[model samples]
Target chain A: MIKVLFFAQVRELVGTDATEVAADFPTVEALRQHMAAQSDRWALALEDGKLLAAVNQTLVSFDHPLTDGDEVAFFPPVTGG
Target chain B: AETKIVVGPQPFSVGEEYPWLAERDEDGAVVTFTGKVRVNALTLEHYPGMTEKALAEIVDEARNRWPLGRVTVIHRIGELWPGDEIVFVGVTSAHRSSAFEAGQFIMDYLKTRAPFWKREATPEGDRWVEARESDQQAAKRW
Candidate 1:
C-alpha cells in the first residue's frame, strides 16, 4: 500500500487529508496520475506543475521510484523557517 | 551531541533553551534565530509525521557540515497573530563561525525544504504565502 498525504493548499484543494492506495505505480508521478482521475479538483491540484512531492519524508523528483509501504506527501513549496 | 526538533502550537522561549544548548563543556558558542509572525495574522499548517522527520534530516545535514554540539529547532502551528513567535533555531559549536553558518544553513534549507506552509490574512481573506525567490536563492548557496 502507498500512504498518501496532502498538506496546506494541496490538502484544501484536493479536499482530503490522507489515504491509502494501491502501490501499483513505478513512480510518484504514476500514482498521482491515478489520483488526479478522482475528480476535476484532484486533477487540477495534482496535475499542476507547481506541486511538490516527498517520498518517505524527504523530497524527491516526480520520477523517483516507489515501492509498497512507502509514504508520500504532496504539498506546495515550504515557507517555514 | 544532543539534537531536538519540535513542531507544534506550544509557545516557546529561546531564553529557556539557551542554557540547554550551552550545557556542553566543549561548546563555546551558541547562535540562535527566532522568526516571529510579522504584521499579519496567519495560520501555519504542517504534515505531522513528515514535518518532524524532515526537521531531523535538516539537522543531520548541519551536523554533517559542522562540528555542531546540541542543536534545537522549534516551530509552532495553528492560529498565530502578528508579533507571535513562529519558529526558533539554535546551534552550538566550539567556535562562533561554524555555529552561525550552520544555523543559517539549517534555516535556509528549512524555508524551502520542510513541509510547513503559511496562509496569511489579507483584505481579500486568507491567501497562501508564496515561496520567496530569495529563499530559493539562499538555499542553493549551500
Candidate 2:
C-alpha cells in the first residue's frame, strides 16, 4: 500500500491528513489523477496549479516513479520565511 | 563547523542563541535574522517528516557556498500570536561579507524550499497566506 498525505490548506480542503491506497499507480501523476477522481473537493484541490507534491518526503515532479510503501504528499506552494 | 536546525512549537530566544554563535573568536562576524508573527494570530503548519529534512538541506547549501563557522536555524510551528518570534537564522563566519551573504541566502532559500505554511486568523476567518512572487524572485538569486 502507498500512503498519501496532505498538509496545510490542502489538508483542510481534503479533510484528511493521510490515507492508504493499494499500490497501483506507477507514477505520481497517475496517483494524482486517481485522487482527483475521488470527489469534487479532491478534484478541485488536486487540480490547483499551485499545488506541489513530494514523494517520500522529498519534493518531486509528477513523473516521479512510485512504489509500494512510499509516502506521497500534496500541498499548496509553501509560504514560510 | 557546527550546524543546528530546529522546528517545533516551543518558543525560541535569539538573545540566548546569539551568544552561542559568537563563541568563536576566529569568526569576526555573526549575522542573525529573526522573523516574527505579524498578524493577530497565525497557525504555522508543516509536514513533520519533511520540515526538518528540508531545513537541514537548506543549511547544507549555505555551508557549501560560504566559509561559515556555526549556523543555527530555529523555526516555530503550531499556534503563534502577533509579536511572537517565528523563525531565527544565525550565521558566524570569518568575515562580515560571508556572514551576511550566507544569512540572507539561508533565509531566502528557506522561504521557498521549506515545507511550512502559515494561516492567519482574522476577525473574518482563517486564511492561508498566499505564496508571494517576490519570494520566488528572491530565491532565484541563489
Candidate 3:
C-alpha cells in the first residue's frame, strides 16, 4: 500500500489531505496514472502538470520507483517560508 | 544547566532569547533565523497537524545531528500583517557549524516539508503563492 498525501490547494481541491491506494504499479508515474483515474478532480489536477511529487518526504520525479509502504505526497509547488 | 527544547508561538521580544548570544558557556555559537511578515502578503494557511508534525521532525533531526545545549522554534499562524514575526529558529551548539547547519536545516525543512500555505494580497489582488521548487532543491542540497 502506498500512502498518498496532498496539501494546500491540492487538498482543498480534492477535499482530502491523504489517502491509501493500492499500488500495483512498479513506478510512481504508474501510480499517479492510477490515481488520476480515481476521480475527475484527480484527473484535472494532474492535467495541468503543476503538482509536485515526493516520495517519503524527498522530492522526486514521477518516474521514481515505488516500493510497498512508501509514502507518496503530491502538493503544489510550496509557497510558504 | 540542563539542556532545553522549546517549541511554540514566539512572541515578539526585544530581549530574552534575542540577546545573550555570547553568555552561555556550553554553547560556542548561537544561530537564529527570523521570518517576518511580507508586506505584500495578507494571509497564510497551513495544514495544522502536518505543519506541527513536520516541524517536530525537523527539530528532532537537528537534535540528532548536532550537540546542542538548547533549541527553540516559534511560528505564528492566523492573520498577520507586515513586519510581524512569522517564524523563529534558534540553535545553540558547542561549535559554529552545527548551529549554523541546524538553523539552516530548520528553515529548509520548514519550507520543503511543512504544510504552511500562503496567499498574497498583492496590489493586483489576492494570489496563492506556490512553494518554490528551488526551496526543495535547496533543502536537498543540505
Candidate 4:
C-alpha cells in the first residue's frame, strides 16, 4: 500500500491527514489523477498544478515511479523561514 | 566545524546560537539571520520526517555552494505570536562574502523548498498562508 499525506490547506480541503491506498499507481501522477477523480474535494485539493510532491521524503517530479510502502506527500509551497 | 539543523516547537536564542559558529580560530566571518513571527499568532505546520530531511538537504546545498565553517538552522513550530522568533540561521566562514552568500542561499531555499507551512490566525478565523511569488523569484535568482 502507498501512504498518502495531505498538509496545510490541502488537508483541510481533503478533510483527512493521511490514508493508505492500494499500490495500483504506476507513478505519482497516476496516483494523483486517480485520487482527484474520487470526489470534488479531492479534485479541488489536488487539481492545482502548483502544488508540490515528495516520495519517500524527497522531492520528486510527478513522473517519478511509485511502489508499495512508498510514502507520498502533497503540500503547498513552503513558507517557513 | 559543526552543522546543526533543528525543526520543532522549541524556541531558541540567537545570541547563544551564533556564538557556536565562531569557535574555530581564523574562521573570520560569522553571519546569522533570525526570522520573527509577525502580525497575528499562528501555528507553523510541517511534516515530521520530511521537514528534517528537507532542511538537511538545504544546508548541504549551501555547503556545496560555499566554503562554510559552521552552520545552524532552527525553525519553531506550534503557536506563535507577533515578535516571537520563528526561524534562525547562522553561518561562519573563512571570509565575509561567502558567509553572507551562504546565509542568503540557505534562507531562500528554506522559504521556497522546505516542507513547513503557516496556518495563520485571521480575523475571519484561521487560514493557511499563501506562498509568495517573490520567494519563488528569490530562489530562482540562485
Best-performing candidate as measured by TM-score: 4
Clash-forming residue pairs, model 4: none
The lowest-lDDT stretch of 10 consecutive residues in candidate 2 chain B is B36-45
Q: Model 4 over residues B22-112: C-alpha lDDT tens digits? A: 7788679999999998667788889988878888898898888888888898988898988899998898889999999999988998998
Please provide the root mean square deviation of candidate 4 (C-alpha atoms, Å).
Answer: 1.2
Ranking by DockQ: 4, 1, 2, 3
Q: Which pairs, if any, clash in model 1? A: none
lDDT tens digits, residues B1-142, model 1? 9998989999998879888988988999999999988756889888887888888999999999999999999989988998899889999999999999999998998898888898998888999988898999999999
Q: What is the C-alpha RMSD of each candidate to the true structure, in Å?
A: 1.5, 1.6, 4.5, 1.2
Chain B TM-score per candidate, please: 0.96, 0.96, 0.81, 0.95
TM-score of 2: 0.93
Candidate 4 lDDT, A1-81, residue by residue in tens: 999999988888989999889999999999999988989999999989788899999988999999999999988788785
Better of 2 and 4 by DockQ: 4
The C-alpha stretches of model 1 lying farther than 4 A from their native spots are none
Model 2 lDDT tens row, B1-142: 8888899999989889998888999888999999988746889889989988888888888889999998899999988998889999999999999999999999998898889999888889988888898888999988
Model 4: which docking level applies?
high
Fnat of candidate 1: 0.86
Rate residue B83 of model 3 by lDDT: 85
